[PDB]
Amino acid sequence: KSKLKPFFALVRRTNPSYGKLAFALALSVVTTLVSLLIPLLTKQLVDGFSMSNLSGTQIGLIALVFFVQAGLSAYATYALNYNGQKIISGLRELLWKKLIKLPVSYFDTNASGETVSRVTNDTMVVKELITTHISGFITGIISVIGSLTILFIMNWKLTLLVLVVVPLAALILVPIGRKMFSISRETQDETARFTGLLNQILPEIRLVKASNAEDVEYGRGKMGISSLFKLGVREAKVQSLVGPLISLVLMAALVAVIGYGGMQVSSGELTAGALVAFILYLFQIIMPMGQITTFFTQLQKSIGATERMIEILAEEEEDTVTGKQIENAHLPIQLDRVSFGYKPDQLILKEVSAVIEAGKVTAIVGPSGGGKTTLFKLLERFYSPTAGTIRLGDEPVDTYSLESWREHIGYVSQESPLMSGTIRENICYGLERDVTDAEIEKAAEMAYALNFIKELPNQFDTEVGERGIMLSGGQRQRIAIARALLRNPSILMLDAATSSLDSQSEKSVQQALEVLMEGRTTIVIAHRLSTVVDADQLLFVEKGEITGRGTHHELMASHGLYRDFAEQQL
C-alpha cells in the first residue's frame, strides 16, 4: 500500500498546533519571498543608499525593519519548535495509553523494554524531523517555484530542460530513499533490542556479581553497540552519497542546456549574454533543491521508526464496554469445561470443571507445573478461556465488565511484586476511594506487617526501591497481602501467599485472614498441606486437570497420590 497516508494520519491524531504551524509557514513564506525579491532590484538598493547618504533620519527605519525581520524569523522558529514538541508529546501520550491498555498476552509475547525504547526513541526521531527540515523544505519549495517562474519569464524554452531534470532527480533519489527507510527501521529496532537487553541485565548486576559473568555481559553490550554503530555508519554513507548524485544530475542538466543553447544561438544569438544570466540563475536553483531533497530523505527516515509505532497503535484493548456490574459479589463460581494454551497448540488446562462455593476456602494443591496459577489467571479473566466459560450463578462471566469483576477480587501473585515508591503507595496502589490512615493501619495489622513498618521512618518513608529490593522477602509478601486485604474484595485469591514467611508469622497471618475473610469466598494455593488442612473443598490439580475433588479425608482416600504428599509431610 502506502506509508505517507498512515504517517500523516498519525500526526493528525496527535492533535498538533495546526493553525499555529500554518501561521508560522505563512510568515516564513512571506519573509522568504520578500528577501528573494529584494536583491533583484539593485537599482532600488543604490538609490536608497544615495538617499540615506542624503536623508538624515533613515537609519531608524532600516534598523527597525531589520529588527522586525529578525523577530519574525525567531518567532517562526519558536513556533515550529513548539509545534514539534506538542506533536511528540501527543505521540507519547497516545502510545502510552495504548500500551497500558493492551491485554496481558501482547506483553507476554513481545516484552516491555523493546516497547519503551520504541515509544521514547521513535518520538525523539519524529521530533528531530518535524522542527527544522519542514521549514527547510517550505523555504526551498518557495524559492524554487519563484526562480522557476523568473526563468520561464526570461525564456519559455530552457525551462523545459529543468522540467526534464526534475523527473531525473526523482528517479536517482528513489533508491536512496528506500535504502534510508530500511536503514532507519533496522536502527530503531536494534536500539530497542539493546535497551531491552540492558534493562534485563541491570538487576542481574546483583545476579552477575553472584556469578563471575561480568565479561560475558560486557561482551554482549559491546556486540549490541557494534551493531548499532554499523547501522549508523551505513546510514551516514547513504546520506553522504545523496549529495553527489544531485550534483551530477544538475551538472548533466546544465550541460544539456548549454548544448541546446548552442543551436538556439542561431536566432537568439546575442541572447548568449542572457544565457550567461540564465547560468547564474540556474546556480540559485541549486541552493534549495538540496534542501528539498534533504527533506525527502528525512521524511523517509522518520517514517521508518514511526512505522513500528503504528503497529502498536492498532492491537485492540479491553475496557468496561459491557457495563454489567456484578452488583451481587456473593455467588458460587462454576468452572465449566475450560482449557488453556498460551500458544494455540499446547494445552495446560485440559477439560477442567468444578465449583468454588462461596463462604469456604477452596484450596488448589498439586505438584509444581500442574497449572495452578493459570487457573487464577482465568478466574481473573486475564485471558479468555478457549474450551468453555466460567459462570457466577448461571451467568456467563463475559457478561460482566472488567472494571467491575476485577474490583471485587483480591489477587496475591506467586511472585509478589512491589513498585518503586513509598510503602503506603504500594499498599494503596490503584485504589480510587481515599484510604485516610485507619484503613492502612488495619490492613497492616491484619497482615502482621505493622510490627516492622513502625520500626522504620513510618509508612511514608523507606522507599522500596526497584522491584522491592530495599525490603526482605517476607516483608514484601506481607506488604502484598496487606494490599490485597486493603482492597477489601469479595473474592480473595492467595496463590503461595505464605511461601517465604516463618511459622509464627504464617500462623498469625492465617488466623487474621481466616477471621476476616471467613464470611467471603477465598481461593488459596498452598504447597504446604498444613495451611490447607482445615479447608472445605480441595481441588488437587495434576497436569492441568482436577483428578481429586473433595474434602481432606475424602480426597485423601480417593486420589492416592495426595496421600503421598500428606504422608511425606507427616
Ligand X SMILES: Nc1ncnc2c1ncn2[C@@H]1O[C@H](COP(=O)(O)OP(=O)(O)OP(=O)(O)O)[C@@H](O)[C@H]1O
417 contacts ligand X (rule: CB under 6 A)? no
Q: Are β-strands 491-495 and 522-525 bridged in parallel, bridged antiparallel, or unpaired?
A: parallel
Q: Please give the residues from 131 up to 190 whose contact with its own copies meets the rule CB under 8 A.
A: none
Residue 78 contacts its own copies per CB under 8 A = yes
Q: Is 20 one of the binding residues for its own copies (CB under 8 A)?
A: no
Length of the chain: 570
Which of 394, 455 has the CB closer to its own copies?
A: 455
- Does residue number 188 form part of the binding site for Mg ion (CB under 5 A)? no
In one-letter notation, the amino acid at residue 300 is Q
Interacting residues with Mg ion between 523 and 562 (CB under 5 A) = none
Contacting its own copies within 91-110 (CB under 8 A): 92-93, 96-97, 99-102, 104, 107-108
Are 495 and 487 in contact, with CB atoms under 8 Å apart? Answer: no
Asked if 191 interacts with its own copies (CB under 8 A), we say yes
d(CA 470, CA 227) in angstroms, rounded, equals: 36
Q: Which of 55, 414, 451, 569 binds ligand X (CB under 6 A)?
A: 414
Does 368 sit near ligand X (CB under 6 A)? yes
DSSP 427-441: HHTT--S--TTHHHH
Find the binding residues for its own copies in span 288-327 (CB under 8 A).
319
With CB under 6 A as the contact rule, the residue among 196, 224, 370, 548 that binds ligand X is 370
CB-based contact 312:95 (threshold 8 Å): yes
Which cell numbers hold the place of 310? Answer: 503504528
Name residue 282's amino acid. Answer: L
Nearer to its own copies, 338 or 501 (CB): 501
Question: Which of these ranges, 143-151, 385-393, 405-413, 437-445, lies near its own copies under the rule CB under 8 A?
Answer: 405-413
Which residues, in sequence order, are bridge partners of residue 400? Answer: 324
Q: What CA–CA distance (Å, rounded) separates 462 from 200?
A: 25
Q: What cell was used for 539?
A: 481441588
Judged by CB under 6 A, the residue of 15, 35, 149, 472 near ligand X is 472
Residue ranges in 405-434 that form contacts with Mg ion under rule CB under 5 A? 414
266 binds, among Mg ion, ligand X, its own copies, none (CB under 5 to 8 A by kind): none
Nearer to its own copies, 141 or 566 (CB): 566
CB of 439 to its own copies, least distance (A): 16
**Nearest to ligand X of 23, 382 (CB atom):** 382
Taking CB under 8 A as the criterion, which residues in 413-432 touch its own copies? Answer: 413-415, 417, 419-420, 429-432
Distance in angstroms (rounded) separating the CA atoms of residues 341 and 349: 7
Q: Which long-range contacts (CB under 8 A, 24 or more apart) does 163-171 make?
A: 164/253, 164/256, 165/249, 165/250, 165/253, 168/249, 168/252, 168/253, 169/246, 169/249, 169/250, 169/289, 169/293
- Which of these, 133, 137, 153, lies nearest to 288 by C-alpha position? 137
Cβ-based neighbour number of residue 231 at 10 Å: 19
- Residues between 285 and 344 that touch ligand X (CB under 6 A): 342
Scan residues 491-510 and list those touching its own copies (CB under 8 A).
496, 499-505, 507
Pick between residue 243 and residue 560 the one whose CB is nearest to its own copies: 243
Interacting residues with Mg ion between 286 and 315 (CB under 5 A): none
Kindly state the helix (H) or strand (E) to which residue 362 belongs, with its residue range: strand 361-364
Q: Which does 26 bind (CB under 5 to 8 A by kind): Mg ion, its own copies, ligand X, none?
A: none
**What is the contact mask toward ligand X in residues 83 to 122, using x (rule: CB under 6 A)?**
-------------------------x--------------
- CB proximity list for 271: less than 8 A, separation 6 or greater: 264, 265
> Across-strand partners of 412?
494
Cβ(155)–Cβ(147) below 8 Å: no
Q: Within 10 Å of residue 377's Cβ, how many Cβ atoms?
A: 17
Place of cell 536517482: 172
Q: Is 458 in the site for its own copies (CB under 8 A)?
A: no
Q: Of 374, 401, 521, 531, which lies in the binding site for ligand X, with binding defined by CB under 6 A?
A: 374
Residue of 67, 145, 256, 311 that binds its own copies (CB under 8 A): 67
- Give the Cα separation of 291 and 296 in Å (integer): 9
Beta bridge partners of 363: 524, 538
**Using CA atoms, how far apart are residues 58 and 66, in angstroms rounded to an integer?**
13
Sequence-separated (6 or more) residues with CB below 8 Å from residue 434: none
Q: Report the residue from 291, 373, 510, 531 that binds ligand X according to the rule CB under 6 A.
A: 373
Q: How far is the CB of 375 from Mg ion (least distance, A)?
A: 10
Q: Does 473 bind ligand X (CB under 6 A)?
A: yes
- Taking the C-alpha atoms of residue 493 and residue 523, their distance in angstroms, rounded to an integer, is 5
Look-up: residue for cell 523507606? 462
- Closest residue by Cα to residue 538 from 382, 298, 361: 361
| Binding of residue 473 to Mg ion (CB under 5 A) | yes
Nearer to its own copies by C-beta: 384 or 569?
Answer: 569
Provide, rounded to whole angstroms, the least separation between the CB of residue 374 and ligand X.
4
Given its own copies, ligand X, Mg ion, none, residue 152, with its beta carbon under 5 to 8 Å by kind, binds none
Consecutive H or E run containing 356: strand 349-356
CB of 412 to Mg ion, least distance (A): 12
Instruction: Name the residue with the smallest CB distance to ligand X.
Output: 474
Q: Which of 147, 298, 373, 505 binds Mg ion (CB under 5 A)?
A: 373
Distance in Å, CB of 151 to its own copies, minimum:
18
Residue 336 in contact with its own copies, rule: CB under 8 A: no
Q: How far is the CB of 535 from Mg ion (least distance, A)?
A: 18
Which residues here bind Mg ion, judged by CB under 5 A?
Answer: 372-373, 414, 473
- Chain residues binding ligand X by CB under 6 A are 108, 342, 348, 368-374, 414, 469-475, 500
